[PDB]
């Protein structure tokens, strides 16, 4: 590649944490999403433990 | 053979030529073709003479068959559609919290 | 200007003479409401 | 529910709100005096099936 | 115009919009024939000469 | 399973049991203003569904 | 007991305002036993609630609270930091949970890998520990159940309504009251036989917008079972001042015609949100009066009424009503006789769309009585500060009377392009015939002409006057359509208004102006063509704001000193480039203590260049003219709190008292200061 691979810089913990933490609360605004995703990781920590980390 | 230059002029030139124009419209639609208020919407008379009742009954069908699809209920569609517009562009986000701040909030 | 009077006087009857019920706008929504 | 005979099979449903001349009893003037309802529904053999 | 001014005739098309829509729907692929017919008969705002 | 007391009372007023042809009645002048339309018709599928 | 309200009632704050006056409730004594509720985080989370659930489910469900009823939720962290929080600091386990899960967690093993306790932690599930736990899919009707019966209750979400929200962990685990005998607050319910909701007030008038969707939707399923009980009822049971919230009820009144001794009624109206402050002041009371005194116009404390409110409707058919400004037969109001007020209530004056300090370009239609208006409120000076003086106003006809031919004579030619006129009486007469309302495809063929003259030369003339106008000062301007302020790049609060009269009727009464009495009108029909449909929305919604918070302060700021409780905000330059002055631009006037928190604020942070001149003023105080031009951002009204009194018009000039000599002006790029005396 010819382009500059932008590094982050790493930002402090605390503020990244809040700043993603944000952002993810903004995606999954309602209860059905959050519901979904919740069920799927239970499920998959049920059966899917060990072939995908 | 003709030129391919990239015209140029000040910004301020732009929004002051380009933004000024106006539509010019020789056959409103009359007042009386309107129904009073509902909140900010005024609705078109059904026993309208005018060439805006076709434009109405187009968008209003459109709408309907829209809002009927079960698609457009469930949160996949959306967050999807919420999801469209936020991208790394700017969206003059100065204004946006310069306005907020105007109202007391954080 | 007896005759501007008149005028004047025949369009304060017209105004008065409007209508008091009059549904004229399309009544589905409120249908599928009611 | 008719099952498979044409003879039961329902061709129209309506209602009167009105009469329709000098005759005075619904059930002569409901035959010609009425307005047919109902409408169809499409959905999907694939999603039913 | 004589004519128009003596009778008592007044021809509002606030009935044909009012019993039946614009906008009924049916078999969504196309229009459906109230708003075919309301559509080629717009009511009236206009002059029945 | 619903419960209702057992004892002397105070003799409650509460206006609810209605005959037959009322509802008759406003089951036709309901299905009268449905008639033909679908989009009436379309939400109360959707509800019970 | 228990009586709701249409408004948001607070422990705090609703006690202060008291809420009871007023609706208009006699409850003022040592009473001390109407306590009210805290429904501010109630409406916070019924907000927040309608967001994910439907509104029908959560406002049948909150209607069968019990507010008498004390109780709390608290919620627990999901299951994995749930068992961290086992762990950590272990004795705080309920005795429910399984007895191998317990026996595992008082281990202090790392817990990395065991075997066994993953499968024990994979099978447990927070419900059968906790026995009320509400859900994440609660269908809420089970909450309001569960917090009528019960003391606590255990939620694994935040979208919970009834009650306040209390942590169970600490913060780590997680991410970003007495009664008395009259309890009240909003949010009505039927959960006891003595729960009552105050009438009185329209559902129409709510103004929260979610206490009314409540109260819609509640009383449109529980008419017949709610107890209602009037002000008066409540009154016989129980027996940082804010400017722009102003009491507000309508007048009922008819008309009557007092001939020959022979009272006849003749028609009912209703007023429609006057405010109760000019009421008190004009002094109305249930009694006759006569609404013209001299000449057939209108005695103006009337105007001022009409002008002050939103639109009187006939009682008999329930439609908007429009009284005659003319004194000719069939309709002429000439006596009436208040018989009584309705519903009362607070409104708030500040309009939501204004925010930040600028012009104000209020649009009416031609007709109205703008001239009389302007009269009537160049007069107006409360505290010495004069709120609205005729030079701070632009007349609308005068964007168009500065050319050489002016406009409405550029528009009397226009008789030319017609197929045949030969006359402005000819024009007249082929567009209206024997009344107004004129031949529509005639009107539309004049239209057709009359546009192309307000496009082309009306526009451009006033994208410049505007922008002239705009440079030396802030004014109130005036219009005949919005789009001349649409066309012509406006820049301002554009505010659409309308008056509750018959506006084509004055076109016929005034006599001297250019044209015929015809012309005029046909001209204002043109105007009303060119309007692009929006809501007027009833020219007292501006003059409340205008009148209503002075009246108030003056209340407040009657008898104080005028040093310490006055101010003025305006551009700042410095004491040299005299080859201080600062031109004002606002003038404050507020008690000293919000006096003294305004002479901290920053008030530095805005810029604008000022343009001094050398002109003079025939005014007295000697002054010379100036203007100035904001940069960046303008002025929000958050920093001019609601607890002042602002003035919405000033004119640019700066005051000279010292060494008068005026040297070739200049400009100075000034910086916005605060400005007021030791106080």
């Known amino acids: 590649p010819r382009n500059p691979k932008k590094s982050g810089r790493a930002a402090p913990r605390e503020v990244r944490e809040q700043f993603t933490q944000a952002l993810s609360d903004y995606l999954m605004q309602n209860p059905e999403l959050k519901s979904r995703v919740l069920r799927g990781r239970s499920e998959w920590e049920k059966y899917g433990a060990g072939i995908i980390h | ?106 | 200007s007896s005759e501007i009077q008149r005028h004047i006087t025949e369009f304060i009857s017209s105004w008065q003479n409007h209508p008091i019920v009059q549904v004229s706008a399309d009544v589905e929504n409120r249908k599928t409401a009611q | 529910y008719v099952r498979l005979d044409r003879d039961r099979v329902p061709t129209m449903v309506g209602v009167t709100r009105q009469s329709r001349d000098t005759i005075t009893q619904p059930a002569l003037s409901l035959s010609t005096t009425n307005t047919t309802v109902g409408v169809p529904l499409a959905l999907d053999a694939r999603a039913i099936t | 115009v004589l004519l128009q001014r003596i009778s008592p005739l007044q021809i509002d098309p606030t009935i044909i919009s009012n019993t039946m829509s614009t906008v009924s729907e049916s078999t969504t692929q196309t229009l459906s024939p109230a708003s075919s017919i309301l559509g080629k008969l717009r009511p009236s705002n206009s002059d029945f000469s | 399973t619903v419960t209702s007391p057992y004892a002397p009372s105070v003799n409650r007023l509460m206006p609810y049991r209605i005959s037959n042809a009322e509802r008759q009645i406003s089951q036709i002048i309901r299905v009268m203003n449905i008639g033909n339309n679908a989009t009436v018709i379309q939400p109360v599928l959707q509800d019970i569904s | 007991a228990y009586i709701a309200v249409p408004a948001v009632v607070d422990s705090r704050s609703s006690e202060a305002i008291g809420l009871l006056e007023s609706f208009g409730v006699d409850a003022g004594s040592d009473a001390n036993d109407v306590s009210y509720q805290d429904h501010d985080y109630v409406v916070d989370q019924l907000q927040y609630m309608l967001d994910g659930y439907e509104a029908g489910d959560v406002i049948d469900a909150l209607v069968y609270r019990n507010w008498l009823h004390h109780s709390v939720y608290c919620l627990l962290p999901p299951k994995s930091q749930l068992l961290e929080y086992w762990k950590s600091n272990p004795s705080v386990i309920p005795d429910n949970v399984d007895r191998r899960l317990r026996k595992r967690l008082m281990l202090k093993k790392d817990l990395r890998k065991d075997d066994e306790y993953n499968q024990l932690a994979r099978a447990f599930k927070i419900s059968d520990v906790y026995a009320p736990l509400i859900s994440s899919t609660t269908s809420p009707m089970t909450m309001i159940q569960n917090l009528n019966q019960g003391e606590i209750v255990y939620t694994t979400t935040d979208r919970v309504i009834g009650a306040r929200v209390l942590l169970y962990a600490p913060r780590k685990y997680y991410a970003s009251v007495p009664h008395s005998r009259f309890n009240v607050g909003t949010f009505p319910s039927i959960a006891t036989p003595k729960c009552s909701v105050m009438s009185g007030v329209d559902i129409e008038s709510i103004p929260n917008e979610f206490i009314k969707l409540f109260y819609q939707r509640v009383k449109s399923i529980h008419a017949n079972i709610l107890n209602d009980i009037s002000p008066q009822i409540v009154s016989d049971m129980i027996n940082h001042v804010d400017v722009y919230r102003v009491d507000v009820v309508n007048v009922l009144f008819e008309v009557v015609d007092v001939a020959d001794g022979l009272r006849s009624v003749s028609r009912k109206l209703i007023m429609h949100t006057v405010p109760v402050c000019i009421l008190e002041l004009l002094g109305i009371e249930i009694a006759d009066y006569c609404i013209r005194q001299e000449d057939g116009m209108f005695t103006d404390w009337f105007l001022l009424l009409t002008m002050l409110s939103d639109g009187l409707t006939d009682r008999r058919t329930h439609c908007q009503y429009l009284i005659n400004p003319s004194s000719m037969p069939p309709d002429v109001i000439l006596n009436i006789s208040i018989t009584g007020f309705i519903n009362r209530h607070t409104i708030d004056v500040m309009p939501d769309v204004y925010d930040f300090i600028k012009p104000i370009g209020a649009v009416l239609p031609k007709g109205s009585f703008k001239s009389t208006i302007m009269r009537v409120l160049d007069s107006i000076s409360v505290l010495g500060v004069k709120i609205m003086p005729r030079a701070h106003v632009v007349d609308s006809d005068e964007v168009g009377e500065q050319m050489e031919p002016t406009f409405e004579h550029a528009v009397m030619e226009i008789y030319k392009g017609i197929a045949g006129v030969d006359s402005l009486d000819d024009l007249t007469k082929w567009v209206l015939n024997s009344d107004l309302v004129p031949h529509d495809d005639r009107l539309g063929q004049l239209f057709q002409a009359f546009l192309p003259l307000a496009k082309d030369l009306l526009a451009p003339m006033a994208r410049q006057f505007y922008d002239n106008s705009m440079s030396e000062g802030r004014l109130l301007t005036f219009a005949h359509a919005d789009s001349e302020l649409l066309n012509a790049n406006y820049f301002g609060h554009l505010l659409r208004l309308k008056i509750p009269y018959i506006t084509e009727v004055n076109l016929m009464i005034r006599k001297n102006r250019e044209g015929g009495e015809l012309f005029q009108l046909v001209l204002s029909y043109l105007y009303k063509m060119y309007a692009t449909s929006a809501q007027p929305k009833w020219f007292g919604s501006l003059l409340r704001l205008l009148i209503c918070p002075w009246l108030h302060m003056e209340k407040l700021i009657g008898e104080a000193d005028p040093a310490s409780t006055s101010a003025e905000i305006g551009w700042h330059v410095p004491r040299e480039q005299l080859m201080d002055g600062f031109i004002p631009y606002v003038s404050i006037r507020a008690p000293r203590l919000v006096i003294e928190e305004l002479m901290e604020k920053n008030w530095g942070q805005y810029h604008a260049q000022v343009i001094v001149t050398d002109q003079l003023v025939v005014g007295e105080p000697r002054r010379v003219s100036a203007k100035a031009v904001i940069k960046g951002n303008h002025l929000p009204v958050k920093l001019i709190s609601r607890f002042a009194c602002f003035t919405l018009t000033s004119k640019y000039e700066m005051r000279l008292p010292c060494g008068h000599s005026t040297g070739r002006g200049a400009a100075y790029n000034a910086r916005l200061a605060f400005r007021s005396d030791l106080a």
């Open chain 2, 1 to 106: 053979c003709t030129s391919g230059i990239f015209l140029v002029r000040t910004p301020t030139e732009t929004v002051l030529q380009e933004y000024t124009q106006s539509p010019e419209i020789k056959v409103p639609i009359p007042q009386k073709d309107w129904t009073g208020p509902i909140g900010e919407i005024r609705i078109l008379k059904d026993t309208t003479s005018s060439i805006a009742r076709y434009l109405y009954r187009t968008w209003y069908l459109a709408a309907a068959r829209m809002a009927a699809q079960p698609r457009t209920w469930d949160p996949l569609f959306q967050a999807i559609m919420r999801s469209q517009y936020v991208t790394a562009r700017g969206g003059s986000g100065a204004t946006l919290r310069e306005s907020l701040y105007a109202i007391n909030v954080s």
